[PDB]
Design a protein around this ligand. Structure first.
Ligand SMILES: [Mg+2]
Ligand SMILES: [Mg+2]
Ligand SMILES: [Mg+2]
Length: 253
């Protein structure tokens, strides 16, 4: 509710915090499965696509020992029939990776597919209505705003640049993804403070998952747990312990 005087930075989680879980789980990711075949058929000749496929081919070789692993075989020739089979293998492999737990090869192709979806106006990133107005006010009040999500930074930029509220990239000072560390590790938050160029105690982290909130608290970061429609429930003790907010408007600077 009321932010300590020492906070100069607000760090924001995305899923379940600024954006509904339903958008991420039921729209953003399913889009990839629905579109990977068409995307590969359409853009196969693009240098970037050839590079993405090479990365997935290398990853497929590394995963060959796994039960259920889908190989991405060497081509038989270079005719449209050979291409059809190759594309089906890449498609099957992408779907298999997604069906299991998130390799760099998979994320790389996903980011390029989303670039087309968002840039062409096929999809918009959903934000809860209280987010943009509060953020604008926080910045007016001098707060810096950074994002921390397991979603790649490149994908995060697409979400803010094509939101249901228009292009809101200017509302963000910087982005962090798993390259700086995993969200349930306190060391990640110590590195985030270093990257931003502040102290851990200058940060207020808003997130919906308690395991992330507790990791951040262990790093001497201030935390508030955000409750949105569809979030995993909080235990009684958690509701008592953590400062809860159901809207960004509830934060007072
Ligand atoms: Mg979350
Ligand atoms: Mg430091
Ligand atoms: Mg302190």
């Amino acid at each position: 509710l009321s932010v300590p005087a020492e906070v100069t930075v607000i760090l924001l989680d995305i899923e379940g915090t600024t954006t509904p879980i339903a958008f991420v789980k039921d729209i953003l990711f399913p889009y990839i499965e629905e579109n990977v075949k068409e995307y590969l058929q359409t853009h196969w000749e693009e240098e970037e696509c050839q590079q993405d496929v090479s990365l997935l081919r290398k990853q497929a070789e590394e995963d060959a020992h796994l039960d259920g692993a889908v190989p991405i075989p060497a081509a038989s020739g270079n005719g449209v029939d050979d291409l059809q089979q190759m594309i089906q293998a890449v498609v099957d492999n992408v779907c298999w990776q997604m069906s299991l737990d998130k390799t760099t090869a998979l994320k790389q192709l996903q980011g390029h597919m989303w670039r087309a979806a968002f840039t062409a106006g096929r999809m918009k990133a959903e934000f809860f209505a209280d987010v943009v107005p509060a953020v604008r006010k926080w910045r007016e009040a001098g707060m810096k705003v950074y994002i921390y999500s397991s979603g790649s930074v490149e994908a995060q930029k697409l979400l803010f640049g094509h939101s249901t509220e228009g292009d809101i990239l200017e509302l963000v000072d910087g982005h962090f993804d798993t390259k700086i560390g995993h969200k349930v590790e306190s060391e990640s938050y110590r590195k985030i403070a270093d990257s931003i160029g502040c102290s851990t105690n200058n940060i207020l982290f808003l997130t919906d998952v308690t395991r992330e909130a507790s990791a951040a608290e262990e790093a001497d970061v201030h935390v508030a747990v955000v409750v949105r429609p569809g979030n995993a429930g909080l235990t009684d003790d958690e509701k008592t312990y953590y400062s809860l907010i159901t809207s960004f408007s509830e934060l007072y600077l």
